[PDB]
Design an enzyme around this catalytic site. Structure first.
Site, PDB file in Angstrom:
ATOM      1  N   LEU A  72       0.769  -1.230   0.113  1.00  0.00           N
ATOM      2  CA  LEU A  72      -0.078  -0.108  -0.084  1.00  0.00           C
ATOM      3  C   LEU A  72       0.852   1.296   0.041  1.00  0.00           C
ATOM      4  O   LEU A  72       1.900   1.381   0.756  1.00  0.00           O
ATOM      5  CB  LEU A  72      -0.983   0.213   1.085  1.00  0.00           C
ATOM      6  CG  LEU A  72      -1.988  -1.049   1.348  1.00  0.00           C
ATOM      7  CD1 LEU A  72      -2.715  -1.137   2.466  1.00  0.00           C
ATOM      8  CD2 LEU A  72      -2.907  -1.154   0.195  1.00  0.00           C
ATOM      9  N   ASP A  73       0.388   2.268  -0.675  1.00  0.00           N
ATOM     10  CA  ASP A  73       1.010   3.706  -0.442  1.00  0.00           C
ATOM     11  C   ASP A  73       0.564   4.080   0.708  1.00  0.00           C
ATOM     12  O   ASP A  73      -0.224   3.675   1.364  1.00  0.00           O
ATOM     13  CB  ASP A  73       0.324   4.484  -1.769  1.00  0.00           C
ATOM     14  CG  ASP A  73       0.843   5.895  -2.010  1.00  0.00           C
ATOM     15  OD1 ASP A  73       2.364   5.970  -2.556  1.00  0.00           O
ATOM     16  OD2 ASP A  73       0.700   7.050  -1.545  1.00  0.00           O
ATOM     17  N   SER A  74       1.431   5.304   1.188  1.00  0.00           N
ATOM     18  CA  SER A  74       1.010   5.855   2.452  1.00  0.00           C
ATOM     19  C   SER A  74      -0.399   6.747   2.609  1.00  0.00           C
ATOM     20  O   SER A  74      -1.002   6.490   3.448  1.00  0.00           O
ATOM     21  CB  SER A  74       1.993   7.036   2.749  1.00  0.00           C
ATOM     22  OG  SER A  74       3.376   6.437   3.022  1.00  0.00           O
ATOM     23  N   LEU A  75      -0.871   6.884   1.355  1.00  0.00           N
ATOM     24  CA  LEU A  75      -2.076   7.620   1.145  1.00  0.00           C
ATOM     25  C   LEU A  75      -3.155   6.757   1.268  1.00  0.00           C
ATOM     26  O   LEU A  75      -4.446   7.098   1.487  1.00  0.00           O
ATOM     27  CB  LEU A  75      -2.040   8.459  -0.145  1.00  0.00           C
ATOM     28  CG  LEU A  75      -1.274   9.722  -0.321  1.00  0.00           C
ATOM     29  CD1 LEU A  75      -1.265  10.355  -1.543  1.00  0.00           C
ATOM     30  CD2 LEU A  75      -1.345  10.654   0.701  1.00  0.00           C
ATOM     31  N   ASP A  76      -2.885   5.545   0.810  1.00  0.00           N
ATOM     32  CA  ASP A  76      -3.964   4.269   1.077  1.00  0.00           C
ATOM     33  C   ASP A  76      -4.094   3.940   2.573  1.00  0.00           C
ATOM     34  O   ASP A  76      -5.265   3.722   3.004  1.00  0.00           O
ATOM     35  CB  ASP A  76      -3.178   3.141   0.384  1.00  0.00           C
ATOM     36  CG  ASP A  76      -3.122   3.288  -1.073  1.00  0.00           C
ATOM     37  OD1 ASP A  76      -4.244   4.280  -1.541  1.00  0.00           O
ATOM     38  OD2 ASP A  76      -2.262   2.687  -1.724  1.00  0.00           O
TER      39      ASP A  76
END
Ligand SMILES: CCCCCCCCCCCCCCCCCC(=O)OC[C@H](COP(=O)([O-])OCC(O)COP(=O)([O-])OC[C@@H](COC(=O)CCCCCCCCCCCCCCCCC)OC(=O)CCCCCCCCCCCCCCCCC)OC(=O)CCCCCCCCCCCCCCCCC
Ligand SMILES: CCCCCCCCCCCCCCCCCC(=O)OC[C@H](COP(=O)([O-])OCC[N+](C)(C)C)OC(=O)CCCCCCCCCCCCCCCCC
Ligand SMILES: CCCCCCCCCCCCCCCCCC(=O)OC[C@H](COP(=O)([O-])OCC[N+](C)(C)C)OC(=O)CCCCCCCCCCCCCCCCC
Ligand SMILES: CCCCCCCCCCCCCCCCCC(=O)OC[C@H](COP(=O)(O)OCCN)OC(=O)CCCCCCCCCCCCCCCCC
Ligand SMILES: CCCCCCCCCCCCCC(=O)SCCNC(=O)CCNC(=O)[C@@H](O)C(C)(C)COP(=O)(O)O
Ligand code: SF4
Ligand code: SF4
Ligand code: SF4
Lengths: 55, 156, 43, 114, 318, 176, 82, 115, 185
Positions: free
Chosen positions: G38-42
């Protein structure tokens, strides 16, 4: 300027001023549309001597 | 025939009613709004031609884009134009409303309101004289006079 | 030389002050005309 | 190398401000689709917000990302207040523009731009 | 043959509105040092026909957000109440001779506010709602003196009968005994009809067009002609109240020509007040009809109650 | 050297208090304003009957552009590009070549009349009086590109309006 | 707020309504970044989905320390009684 | 009967000037022309929000002075009575009570507007 | 056109919808007539409408394709609907009441001659009746939008854009996530 003197007098009474002396419509007193050819004067540096640009 | 005469006289009636009752909306943008006000001034006097201001776009006929259309007021011009009933007309006043004008190569100038609204009459000048704007309005009236709405409808 | 110049003696006087010349009747005369109209109407 | 900051003393406070800005845009997008009565879904607007944040995911300078947070909050102030319109919101969706040629062969076919 | 009588009432008072648009624009023109319409007909006499045909062939534009039943029902009620306030007016004989015609005029003055009111509310816009509630802020100011002035002018009449108001003024004009009531009634009819300096609902520079800012052409014509029908009717009502003429029972045309030229002079006075004054802020309107006209109106009401008792000049109710 | 607008205290004797109260109750200044409006009602209005009467102009007037010719038929433009160098809108576009008899004449001379600002720098920069800004101003178009004049339209404006442009320059040129 | 089991199962319900996470690997002790990919914004929108479901505002410094749903259910246990 | 014929006629050619206004011209409806008008740009929120009345105490007091002209209205009729001192006293008492109400609303700053 | 121009590119759209169409705006402007009459409740005819931007992209990519000379294209949408659930979805995006009733042959060809009695544009005609209740054929041999590189956009992305004009006011400000989509076949 062609307003009859009854309407002219009623109009001066309604405004309270003398209106025919100061009309906001222009007539024969303004300048002629065809003017004579002019002769414009030359400046101070239009000289043939003592007229160096460095000074 | 008979019906051609009927629709021709009805076209002349509605074109007369629409050219002799043009209601422009109060819409200036720039220096040309001053000369549009002088086309409303008592010397030139738009109001004798049936040409009288109506402030809302719902109650107006022709939108005189008088001035410079920037990039920030292009959607405002378009939504004002859209909120005009049909038939609506546009008169372009001045060089900036025509083709970008003196600010043609600017980052924030819509280069002519013909990019945004459909334009009927182009009135040229920077600014055009109020006599020339009244000329453009009378040419718009001549353009309305030779419309063939019901003649084309009877011939379609 | 010929040039757009003012005339010899200069131009005439040009008024520029407030000229509101105070027309109309006074207060008491207007009240008298009004009350006289009231009394004639009442009679 | 001693410069004056803007809000963030280092990258951690800067990422905190980016994260709060992303939270604010993610809350704003359903109202943006609603009150502007746009013709996109809420998920499509959230994808565009994700793309506009991932566009600038390479900067390691705290002042630059502070200014990006400031400019993003100015965009958000113009979004919450109805100062932008349907046109200014839909300018983020490059829709009327044709998709540019990306490969070498079609750029060679259509023009001179590398 | 009474239907012919109704039609010969209500068609010439639409054509009077139509040519009042030409009279309005030309008198407003010459008072503003310009000319009025003079191009469309011979000196402008065909300009109203073009202004009338143009609006009923332009696109009607019912808006999206509008409550469409009230949005169409409001100009219908506007034009209906524009027409039905002419029927008790004695010219010298009215269409419908009412025993209580003055209160009929007052009640249909009150009901005509709902035209502007429901039109501004139903067209779901913001300037329309501002104009619709400035109509309330104007109506609660003029109605609270429009009844007492009209009450005090009938204490010299004897009844609420408009036809008896000609017999009442057979000796003297009724502007002579009641000129403060007359010069206050005239301002209350200015404020009643949204004419300048009391525009304040169709305020062109505060609002855009106010209550009818959404009404495009066709439904817009029935507010324009309603407003002008109200000003002609209201100057005729003011002429009957305060400037009543000579009635020959064998020659009604003498009275008709006389109050016709008097009501034309009052309509020209409306256009001449419109062409000279700035426009009120509508609190200064409310601080006028409540703080200046209403105390003096109550004083004059006490005066015109107690004065026929004082002079044994109580008029008959028969 | 300065004056105080609105610094008049009203008089407080019974005469002036009664005058101000009659002004309040009997509306003196409102009748004064109605009198001034009625005084303008009875005047001859200043509306000229356009298009049959035309507003007054001077021989300095700056309207539609036109290329003049010498009194021999030879056109005056010798392709020197001062007019497009001074043009503040860059409405003028000039391209030239030596023509068949070796003369320095233009091939392209375009004036975009939707960029042009009608300021007359091109007629005062032109050293041979070739481009002038003539007296026509009623040249409105129904189409945008009809106001993109090439050399042929400017030469036709010159050959159309030369009988007036020559007289305006004849009446004006001593002021230049 | 009633039971820890309902809060854990509600965290699982939030993350199975979430579309990027593989439901097969989705466990209570699964890490978001290096396991779920996952991305951080996810993870930030995971935290905002937790705010939508549970109904209490979660600050920044204690949501960046939430790298598995066990940390999520423990943080929800810390801010309530259970 | 004649009054109802007159009202029906006026209502009829009020609604006959509306149905020749909608059904006669040519319509080109699209979902930007029927939008709300807020001077070129979009309305920031609907017009069905509470548009606060500042003249509200005067608006209530209109309802309490509008009953006064339901009381003071038969004075052209009540002057025809044979008990005239009592009629005069009660009439001037009602206009005086209206004036005392208006004076109390004056001095308590109620005719002034809020904010 | 084929036998007088051998390289004619002939294009077959099924049912074109847009802001100014007469397909979704035909369905949406029959509400005050009585309840949207159909033959056999409009469930025996199958349609796949195509969006006008996809049709335009197909026409212009056929302009720029030299391999489209002489071809015959069939521009259809990505999903096939019945007519009944299509009209369901039209009135459900427009947030309108939906009270259908069947209307057989006995007078629904006579509402044609009932509704072109004036010389204006007829609101509906019997040819339009025969074409609304005509199913869209499936021609696998003719190429379509995807054979020109044009992605066929479904109705669930653009029906809100077409049909927001018909919502009164009480459901104008709504969402695209309100309507459950129409079932495909
Ligand atoms: C109100 C009652 C009628 C008033 C008549 C009127 O205005 O006479 C103008 C006359 C002079 O007016 P002025 O403002 O000095 O204008 C001078 C003209 O410009 C100097 O006149 P002019 O050089 O302009 O002469 C041309 C003009 C001459 O003007 C006339 O012949 C006016 C005719 C009016 C009738 O004739 C026309 O323009 C052709 C006729 C166009 C107007 C037709 C009006 C019809 C009205 C009835 C329907 O007014 C008076 O003498 C005072 C009013 C008299 C009222 C009498 C009692 C009632
Ligand atoms: C009280 C004052 C007002 C009185 C009433 C108005 C007076 C004039 C009455 C007749 C006006 C003419 C008919 C209405 C105007 C139509 C203008 C128009 O757009 O026409 C094109 C329209 C449509 O023509 P079209 O087919 O070209 O449509 C153009 C629109 N597109 C291309 C988008 C499809 O014509 C008609 O609708 C015909 C109208 C009937 C003709 C007159 C019948 C007798 C009326 C009496
Ligand atoms: C019907 C035919 C025409 C009738 C005549 C009218 C024609 C002229 C119309 C002119 C245009 C007016 C346009 C609208 C103007 C609106 C503004 C305005 O004027 O507001 C009103 C103004 C308001 O004044 P104001 O705006 O200055 O208010 C002052 C407010 N303070 C002090 C707080 C700052 O005047 C009045 O209210 C006067 C009302 C009428 C007065 C009548 C008095 C009669 C005499 C009584 C007795 C006096 C003596 C004492 C007893 C003696 C006994 C023996
Ligand atoms: C209670 C009283 C109410 C009164 C209401 C009306 C008031 C104003 C009355 C009219 C005043 C005069 C108007 C004159 C207008 C101009 C007439 C004219 O000449 O029109 C010319 C026009 C084109 O003609 P054409 O043959 O093409 O010319 C080319 C020549 N080489 O030709 C045409 O346009 C064709 C002919 C049209 C004629 C129209 C004339 C006006 C009609 C108005 C309607 C009312 C009639 C009277 C009603 C009341 C009495 C019953
Ligand atoms: C309708 C659409 C509306 C569009 C809205 C547009 C707003 C755009 C705002 C742009 C502001 C930014 O880009 S701030 C980003 C700058 N940050 C950086 O360069 C630091 C790197 N940041 C990141 O990697 C971010 O993902 C995180 C979450 C802060 C850290 O993640 P790491 O783990 O990897
Ligand atoms: S065309 Fe020129 S003069 Fe005219 S409004 Fe524009 S900038 Fe001003
Ligand atoms: S008048 Fe000015 S803007 Fe126009 S062409 Fe000449 S120099 Fe250029
Ligand atoms: S018009 Fe005059 S200034 Fe311009 S290039 Fe020709 S000669 Fe030179």
């Amino acid at each position: 300027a062609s307003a009859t003197r009854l309407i002219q007098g009623l109009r001066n009474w309604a405004s309270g001023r003398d209106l025919q002396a100061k009309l906001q419509l222009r007539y024969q007193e303004i300048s002629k549309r065809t003017q004579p050819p002019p002769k414009l004067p030359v400046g101070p540096s239009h000289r043939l001597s003592n007229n160096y640009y460095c000074a | 025939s008979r019906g051609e005469y009927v629709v021709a006289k009805l076209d002349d009636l509605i074109n007369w009613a629409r050219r002799s009752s043009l209601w422009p909306m109060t819409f200036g943008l720039a220096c040309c709004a001053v000369e549009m006000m002088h086309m409303a001034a008592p010397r030139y006097d738009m109001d004798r031609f049936g040409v009288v201001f109506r402030a809302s776009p719902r109650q107006s006929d022709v939108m005189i884009v008088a001035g410079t259309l920037t990039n920030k007021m292009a959607p405002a011009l378009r939504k004002v134009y859209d909120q005009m009933p049909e038939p609506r007309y546009v008169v372009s006043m001045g060089s900036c409303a025509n083709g970008g004008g003196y600010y043609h190569y600017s980052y924030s100038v819509v280069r002519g309101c013909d990019r945004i609204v459909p334009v009927d009459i182009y009135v040229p000048g920077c600014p055009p004289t109020a006599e020339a704007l009244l000329y453009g309005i009378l040419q718009l009236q001549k353009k309305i006079k030779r419309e063939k709405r019901l003649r084309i409808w009877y011939r379609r | 030389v010929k040039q757009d110049m003012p005339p010899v003696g200069g131009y005439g006087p040009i008024d520029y002050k407030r000229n509101l010349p105070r027309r109309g009747l006074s207060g008491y005369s207007m009240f008298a005309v009004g009350i006289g109209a009231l009394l004639f109407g009442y009679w | 190398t001693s410069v004056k900051p803007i809000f963030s003393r280092d990258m951690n406070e800067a990422k905190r401000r980016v994260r709060e800005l992303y939270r604010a845009w993610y809350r704003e997008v359903p109202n943006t689709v609603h009150l502007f009565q746009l013709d996109i879904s809420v998920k499509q607007g959230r994808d565009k917000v994700r793309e506009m944040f991932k566009k600038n995911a390479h900067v390691t300078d705290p002042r630059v990302v502070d200014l990006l947070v400031i400019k993003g909050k100015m965009e958000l102030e113009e979004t919450i207040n109805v100062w932008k319109q349907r046109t200014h919101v839909m300018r983020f969706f490059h829709e009327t523009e044709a998709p540019r040629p990306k490969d070498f062969l079609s750029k060679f076919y259509v023009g001179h731009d590398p | 043959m009474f239907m012919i009588n109704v039609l010969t009432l209500i068609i010439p008072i639409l054509l009077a509105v139509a040519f009042l648009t030409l009279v309005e624009r030309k008198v407003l023109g010459y008072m503003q040092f310009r000319k009025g319409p003079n191009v469309v007909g011979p000196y402008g006499l065909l300009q109203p026909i073009a202004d009338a045909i143009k609006l009923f062939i332009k696109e009607p534009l019912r808006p999206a957000t509008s409550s469409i039943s009230m949005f169409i029902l409001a100009p219908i009620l506007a034009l209906t109440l524009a027409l039905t306030m002419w029927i008790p007016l004695p010219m010298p004989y009215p269409l419908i001779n009412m025993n209580l015609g003055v209160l009929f005029m007052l009640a249909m003055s009150s009901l005509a506010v709902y035209s502007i009111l429901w039109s501004g509310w139903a067209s779901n816009s913001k300037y329309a709602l501002i104009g619709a509630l400035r109509a309330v802020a104007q109506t609660i100011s003029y109605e609270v003196t429009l009844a007492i002035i009209l009450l005090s002018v009938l204490l010299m009449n004897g009844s609420f009968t408009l036809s008896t108001l000609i017999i009442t003024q057979e000796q003297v004009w009724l502007i002579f005994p009641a000129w403060p009531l007359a010069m206050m009634w005239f301002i209350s009819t200015l404020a009643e009809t949204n004419r300048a300096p009391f525009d304040l609902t169709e305020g062109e520079s505060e609002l855009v067009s106010g209550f009818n800012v959404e009404y495009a052409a066709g439904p817009f014509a029935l507010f324009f002609m309603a407003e002008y029908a109200n000003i002609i009717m209201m100057n005729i009502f003011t002429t009957t109240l305060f400037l009543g003429a000579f009635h020959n029972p064998y020659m009604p045309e003498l009275y008709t020509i006389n109050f016709t030229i008097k009501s034309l002079l009052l309509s020209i006075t409306f256009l001449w007040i419109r062409a000279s004054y700035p426009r009120f802020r509508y609190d200064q309107l409310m601080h006028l009809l409540w703080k200046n006209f209403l105390p003096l109106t109550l004083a004059l009401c006490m005066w015109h109650v107690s004065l026929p008792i004082l002079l044994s000049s109580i008029p008959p109710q028969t | 050297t300065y004056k105080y607008v609105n610094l008049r205290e009203p008089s407080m004797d019974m005469k002036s208090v009664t005058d101000r109260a009659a002004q309040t109750l009997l509306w003196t200044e409102l009748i004064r304003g109605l009198g001034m409006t009625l005084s303008y009602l009875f005047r001859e209005p200043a509306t000229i009957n356009y298009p049959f009467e035309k507003g007054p102009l001077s021989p300095r007037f700056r309207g539609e552009h036109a290329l003049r010719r010498y009194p021999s038929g030879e056109e005056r433009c010798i392709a020197c590009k001062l007019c497009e160098a001074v043009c503040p809108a860059q409405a003028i576009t000039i391209e030239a070549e030596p023509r068949a008899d070796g003369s320095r004449r233009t091939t392209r001379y375009d004036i975009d009349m939707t960029k042009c600002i009608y300021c007359g720098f091109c007629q005062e920069a032109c050293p041979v009086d070739a481009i002038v800004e003539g007296p026509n101003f009623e040249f409105s178009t129904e189409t945008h590109e009809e106001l993109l004049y090439n050399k042929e339209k400017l030469l036709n404006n010159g050959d159309k309006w030369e009988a007036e442009i020559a007289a305006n320059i004849q009446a004006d040129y001593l002021y230049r | 707020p009633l039971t820890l089991e309902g809060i854990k199962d509600r965290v699982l319900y939030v993350l199975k309504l979430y579309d990027k996470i593989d439901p097969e690997k989705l466990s209570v002790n699964s890490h978001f970044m290096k396991d779920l990919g996952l991305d951080s914004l996810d993870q930030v929108e995971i935290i905002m989905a937790m705010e939508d479901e549970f109904g209490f505002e979660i600050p920044d410094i204690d949501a960046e320390k939430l790298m598995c749903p066990q940390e999520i259910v423990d943080y929800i246990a810390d801010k309530k009684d259970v | 009967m004649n009054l109802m014929i007159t009202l029906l006629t006026n209502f009829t050619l009020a609604t006959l000037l509306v149905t020749i206004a909608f059904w006669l011209p040519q319509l080109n409806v699209y979902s930007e022309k029927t939008s709300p008008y807020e001077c070129g740009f979009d309305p920031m929120g609907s017009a069905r929000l509470p548009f606060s009345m500042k003249f509200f105490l005067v608006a209530i007091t209109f309802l309490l002075f509008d009953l006064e002209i339901a009381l003071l209205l038969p004075l052209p009729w009540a002057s025809q009575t044979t008990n005239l001192n009592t009629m005069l006293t009660m009439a001037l008492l009602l206009i005086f009570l209206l004036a005392v109400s208006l004076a109390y609303e004056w001095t308590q700053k109620g005719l002034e507007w809020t904010e | 056109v084929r036998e007088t121009f051998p390289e004619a590119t002939i294009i077959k759209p099924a049912d074109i919808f847009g802001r100014e169409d007469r397909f979704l705006n035909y369905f949406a402007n029959i509400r005050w007539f009585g309840g949207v009459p159909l033959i056999s409740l409009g469930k025996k005819t199958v349609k796949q409408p195509v969006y006008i931007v996809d049709v335009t992209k197909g026409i212009i990519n056929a302009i720029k394709d030299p391999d489209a000379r002489g071809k015959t294209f069939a521009f259809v949408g990505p999903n096939r609907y019945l007519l009944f659930d299509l009209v369901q979805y039209v009135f459900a995006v427009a947030h309108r009441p939906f009270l259908p009733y069947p209307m057989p042959h006995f007078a629904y060809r006579w509402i044609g001659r009932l509704f072109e009695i004036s010389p204006f544009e007829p609101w509906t005609t019997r040819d339009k009746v025969e074409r609304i209740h005509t199913t869209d054929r499936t021609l696998p041999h003719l190429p379509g939008l995807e054979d020109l590189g044009v992605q066929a956009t479904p109705l669930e992305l653009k029906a809100i854009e077409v049909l927001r004009r018909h919502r009164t006011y009480r459901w104008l400000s709504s969402e695209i996530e309100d309507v459950q989509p129409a079932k495909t076949v």
